[PDB]
From a paper:
SARS‐CoV nsp1 was chosen for the structural analysis as this variant showed somewhat stronger binding to human primosome in our pull‐down assays. We obtained a 3D reconstruction of the primosome at a global resolution of 3.8 Å after sharpening that clearly showed all components of the complex. Thus, the B subunit bound to the C‐terminal domain of Pol α is docked within the open “hand” of the polymerase domain, precluding binding of the template DNA–primer RNA duplex. Furthermore, the heterodimeric primase is held in an extended conformation, whereby the Fe‐S domain of Pri2—required for initiation of RNA primer synthesis 48 —is sequestered by interactions with both B and Pol α and unavailable to contact Pri1, which is excluded from the primosome core and largely solvent exposed. Altogether, the high‐resolution structural data obtained with X‐ray and cryo‐EM methods indicate that—in its unliganded form—the human primosome exists in a conformation that is incompatible with primer synthesis without the intervention of major conformational rearrangements. The structure shows that nsp1 binds to the Pol α subunit of the primosome. The globular domain of nsp1 docks onto the rim of the polymerase fold of Pol α, and its binding site is entirely contained within the inactive exonuclease domain of the polymerase, in agreement with our biochemical findings. Nsp1 binding is mediated by residues in the first, second, and fourth interstrand loop of the globular β‐barrel domain and in the α‐helix at the C‐end of the second interstrand loop. A cluster of hydrophobic nsp1 residues at the center of the interface—including L27, V28, P109, V111, and G112—becomes buried upon complex formation, validating the observation that mutations of nsp1 residues V28 and V111 abrogate the interaction.
The DNA polymerase α (Pol α)–primase complex or primosome—responsible for initiating DNA synthesis during genomic duplication—was identified as a target of nonstructural protein 1 (nsp1), a major virulence factor in the SARS‐CoV‐2 infection. The nsp1 protein is present in α‐ and β‐coronaviruses but not in γ‐ or δ‐coronaviruses. nsp1 is a major virulence factor for SARS and MERS, due its pleiotropic activities as potent antagonist of virus‐ and IFN‐dependent signaling and suppressor of host mRNA translation. SARS‐CoV and SARS‐CoV‐2 nsp1 fold into a globular middle domain (M; amino acids 13–127) flanked by a short N‐terminal region (N; amino acids 1–12) and a long C‐terminal extension that is predicted to be largely unstructured (C; amino acids 128–180). Here, we demonstrate that nsp1 binds directly to the catalytic subunit of Pol α and elucidate their mode of interaction by determining the cryo‐electron microscopy (cryo‐EM) structure of SARS‐CoV nsp1 bound to the human primosome.
Numbering used by the authors:
A (entry chain A): 842 to 882, 898 to 1037
B (entry chain A): 338 to 505
C (entry chain C): 1 to 283, 289 to 360, 379 to 412
D (entry chain D): 22 to 255
């Protein structure tokens, strides 16, 4: 993937992370990446108006089931043991999503798809890097990120202000890319 | 009729000791001890399954040049049942008309053609993966495992309680 | 003509498609000399079978298959698709997504459903020769426009059968046009802006395009004959209130008094012309010009032309309602062409029942068939020429 | 290198030293940044803009009418410098948009530089066909062109050249019914000609920059070009 050169130094201001997990599943949802969908023979992006393919079906099923479990954490007045069960199920769904891309790109795997994996990695690098320059635009500074986390310096000393800054950047990136979490 | 159920944890397959027999392992409830205790279960006659790809225009097997006649599922059926069966020691199988889909990277493969689902018991020797026929281009499922066929054709999604009838 | 009985269709269709249909002639028509590798093998055919059953994807290999499939099921309707990369009848056998149109025809449709607010003679689904003037002028205008503006040499119109016709402009470069090209062309040829039954649907500027000028020059040969004599649009207050709705209100009183003091649509229209000329001198908009454009100019449908895989009735078929045969339109005989003389399957079966397969010559289809061989002779001549040179 | 303007769609295959490589990279970066800043400060058509950017070109020797000096050094410099900027700029969509803006400014200025006599042979060298019409054809079809023309006031069809184009090349132009069509051929003034060519050029550059973005990971393995090509513009 793409690894940013670190702005090495001492940063006295607040530092908050941005976990780029489920990035590849989110991409596969968004651009409809599937074996039945891509016209491999360097591949090309499939048609957007085309029907939602196979891999998106199961990964979106997992994401929606995780979302409904997340709802079940909002409703209080539940047995704590069942709350722990819901948390375990949500975490399992998270890791299964994260490994979705794993099962497709490896010579170690059955479904080794060099072009499909290359397309997914290219899209991931592109979107993370776009987030990088635009968060530069929004008058902050980024110092490190490789497809699984983003280090962000704040230039601020108020924790709540930093948190709401993270919330606003999360919301804007979520409205820029629909299924990314 | 006596029936019982268990929670299956393990699934073992062997290709040479007891080929075609997957020893499913699991965790059974017993009424006599009013608890759960270890159980073994095994299933035989897990037939190997193949999917022959009939061609469209019969080519000469020696050179690949066209022989001037079309190809049908019936055509590949006889071609198999005499020559391939005699060469690789097959005496019984259940050829059926089955339509399946392929959407992977094996080159020159129709997406939704017709497949000759050749279902023969696993005792007969497994066919070579690069088998080619005068009538059929290639066949899938050569070494595809009895364990995965069991898991895949019995709709057993992960570890779930298994109901078994007529326990021999 | 006698009245048509729709219950004789199951036998009449079988007889016609057994004996009289120009199968191999249509075969050359869609084969186009077999220049492309499998242009006819990827040709799309669409049929409507018995009991309103619709089936879409068929591909055929030769005239033998065409004959067998046509005489085996006897569809009520024959419909045409496009030509794709692989065979449409096995389209599912090819990988998903790879299925894409690469060549297709460009078609233009004008129908009586487009003139419900225009015709004072017929209902939505009815026609008459005295309302056929609009269709004739539309044919002539589209003819000149495509033949000179774009040089479209192989223009073929086919009569739909009841309330409209279809065109078939079969140049090769036309066959390889892109969706954007066809769209840009259809908005290039669009002048009528059909809204939510807006009173005014045609407006112009001071500068006049030669396109519109030539179109109107053609139309003026028909306005007096049709709008003012065949339709007589200025016979009643309600009759000319539709025109007054387009005319500015400052002219309404003078038009009303002129029409009351007159007694016929011709006199009222010439008074309208005088008053409109006075208004133009005082102020131009060319009122006489947009009103006639809104009353006569063809009102097209965007989708049928813009679709790279749209479906439309084939020629030489039969109309399920009226039974008329979807025959080409003779480019030389347009001003006097009539839809009620178009052969009907009942009459042509009676001709066959009153009797190398050239039996159409003894049938009333014969002149229109010779029109079809004339068109395909033009196609063959152009193919041979622009291939050899 | 057959003509001064050139469309950049054939990468060079020569061998150059590292010092010349960096000199070209830095010089073209300076040229494009100057184009950006000058276009921001001034209006794109004023003689002050034209003369100032001409002086910038002369001090950076990137373009000039053909002579003994022009053939070898300057146009070759333009070629390799543009392609190394392609490598530098294909990283991001924002950088691609920036580069496209400045190169359109550059190419429009260069086209304004070229005298009217040589634009014919430039279009001929451009490998995509366009046919200029004769004076007799212009005089015969002047009334049609004016009647079907856009809001350009008056009947005046001045010295501006008119070309013959396949209709499929000017889709957005003719689809507004603001041009005359003759047997599937259009006739167009110079401003719309340059608009069409710049739109086509931006399409080709977008596709080529996307392709080079697909080619970046292989070409970045070198260690003597990574720390530059990461930061020519940034
Ligand atoms: Zn009528």
């Amino acid at each position: 993937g793409l690894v940013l050169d670190p702005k090495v130094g001492f940063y006295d201001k607040f530092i908050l992370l941005l976990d780029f997990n489920s990035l590849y599943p989110s991409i596969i949802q968004e651009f409809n990446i599937c074996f039945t969908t891509v016209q491999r023979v360097i591949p090309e992006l499939p048609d957007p108006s085309l029907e939602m393919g196979i891999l998106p079906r199961e990964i979106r099923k997992l994401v929606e089931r995780r979302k409904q479990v997340k709802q079940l954490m909002k409703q209080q007045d539940l047995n704590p043991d069942l709350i722990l069960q819901y948390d375990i199920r949500q975490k399992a769904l998270k890791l299964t999503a994260n490994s979705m891309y794993g099962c497709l790109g490896f010579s170690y795997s059955r479904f080794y798809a060099k072009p499909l994996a290359a397309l997914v990695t290219y899209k991931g690098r592109e979107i993370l890097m776009h987030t990088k320059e635009m968060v530069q635009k929004m008058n902050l500074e980024v110092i490190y990120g490789d497809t699984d986390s983003i280090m962000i310096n704040t230039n601020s000393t108020n924790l709540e202000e930093v948190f709401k800054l993270g919330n606003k950047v999360k919301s804007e990136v979520n409205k820029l890319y629909k299924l990314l979490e | 009729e006596q029936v019982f159920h268990f929670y299956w944890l393990d699934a073992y397959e062997d290709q040479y000791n007891q080929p075609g027999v997957v020893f499913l392992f699991g965790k059974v409830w017993i009424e006599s001890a009013e608890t759960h205790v270890s159980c073994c279960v095994m299933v035989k006659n897990i037939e190997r399954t193949l999917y022959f790809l009939p061609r469209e225009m019969k080519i000469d097997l020696n050179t690949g040049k066209e022989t001037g006649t079309p190809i049908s599922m019936k055509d590949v059926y006889e071609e198999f049942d005499e020559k391939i069966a005699t060469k690789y020691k097959i005496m019984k199988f259940k050829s059926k008309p089955v339509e399946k889909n392929y959407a992977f990277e094996i080159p020159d493969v129709p997406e939704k053609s017709e497949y000759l689902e050749v279902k023969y018991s696993a005792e007969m020797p497994q066919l070579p993966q690069d088998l080619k026929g005068e009538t059929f281009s290639h066949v899938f499922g050569t070494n595809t495992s009895s364990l995965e066929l069991f898991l895949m054709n019995r709709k057993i999604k992960g570890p779930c309680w298994l109901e078994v009838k007529s326990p021999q | 003509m006698e009245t048509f009985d729709p219950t004789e269709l199951p036998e009449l269709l079988k007889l016609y498609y057994r004996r009289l249909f120009p199968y191999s002639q249509y075969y050359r028509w869609l084969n186009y000399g077999g220049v492309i590798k499998n242009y006819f093998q990827h040709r799309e055919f669409s049929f409507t079978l018995k009991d309103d059953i619709y089936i879409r994807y068929q591909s055929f290999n030769n005239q033998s298959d065409l004959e067998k499939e046509m005489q085996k099921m006897n569809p009520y309707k024959i419909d045409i698709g496009a030509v794709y990369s692989h065979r449409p009848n096995q389209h599912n056998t090819v990988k998903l997504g790879a299925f894409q149109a690469q060549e297709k025809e460009l078609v233009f449709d004008i129908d009586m459903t487009d003139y419900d607010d225009v015709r004072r003679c017929c209902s939505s689904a009815d026609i008459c020769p005295k309302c056929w003037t609009l269709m004739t002028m539309a044919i002539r205008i589209i003819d000149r426009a495509l033949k000179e503006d774009f040089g479209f040499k192989h223009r073929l119109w086919v009569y739909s059968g009841r309330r409209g016709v279809h065109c078939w402009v079969c140049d090769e470069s036309v066959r390889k046009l892109s969706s954007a090209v066809r769209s840009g062309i259809v908005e290039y040829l669009s002048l009528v802006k059909g809204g939510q039954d807006v009173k005014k649907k045609v407006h112009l500027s001071e500068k006049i395009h030669p396109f519109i000028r030539k179109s109107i020059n053609i139309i003026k040969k028909y306005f007096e004959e049709y709008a003012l004599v065949n339709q007589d649009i200025l016979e009643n207050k309600e009759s000319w209130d539709k025109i007054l709705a387009l005319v500015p209100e400052t002219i309404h009183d003078e038009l009303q008094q002129s029409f009351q003091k007159s007694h016929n649509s011709l006199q009222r229209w010439e008074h309208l012309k005088k008053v409109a000329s006075r208004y133009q001198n005082n102020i131009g908009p060319w009122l006489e010009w947009e009103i006639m454009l809104q009353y006569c100019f063809p009102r097209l449908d965007i989708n049928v032309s813009k679709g790279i895989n749209h479906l439309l009735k084939s020629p030489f078929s039969v109309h399920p309602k009226t039974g008329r045969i979807s025959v080409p339109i003779d480019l030389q005989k347009v001003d006097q062409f009539d839809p009620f003389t178009v052969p009907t399957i009942s009459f042509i079966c009676r001709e066959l029942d009153a009797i190398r397969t050239r039996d159409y010559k003894k049938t009333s289809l014969a002149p229109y068939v010779k029109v079809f061989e004339h068109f395909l002779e033009n196609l063959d001549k152009s193919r041979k020429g622009e291939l050899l040179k | 290198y057959p003509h001064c303007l050139q469309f950049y769609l054939q990468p060079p295959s020569e061998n150059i030293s590292l010092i010349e490589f960096e000199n070209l990279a830095i010089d073209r970066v300076k040229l494009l940044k100057s184009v950006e800043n000058l276009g921001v400060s001034y209006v794109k058509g004023t003689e002050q803009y034209q003369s100032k950017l001409e002086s910038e070109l002369r001090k950076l020797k990137f373009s000039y009418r053909e002579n003994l000096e022009d053939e070898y050094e300057p146009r070759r410099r333009d070629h390799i410098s543009h392609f190394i900027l392609r490598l530098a700029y294909c990283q991001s969509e924002e950088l691609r948009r920036w580069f496209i803006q400045q190169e359109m400014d550059l190419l429009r200025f260069r086209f304004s530089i070229l005298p009217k006599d040589k634009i014919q042979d430039f279009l001929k060298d451009s490998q995509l066909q366009f046919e200029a019409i004769s004076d007799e054809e212009k005089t015969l079809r002047e009334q049609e062109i004016v009647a079907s023309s856009p809001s350009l006031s008056g009947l005046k069809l001045g010295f501006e050249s008119i070309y013959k184009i396949p209709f499929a090349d000017a889709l957005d132009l003719f689809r507004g019914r603001k041009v005359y069509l003759e047997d599937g051929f259009a006739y167009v003034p110079l401003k719309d000609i340059v608009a069409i060519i710049l739109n086509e050029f931006r399409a080709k550059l977008s596709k080529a920059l996307a392709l080079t973005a697909r080619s970046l990971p292989a070409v970045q393995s070198d260690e003597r070009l990574q720390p530059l090509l990461n930061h020519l513009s940034h």
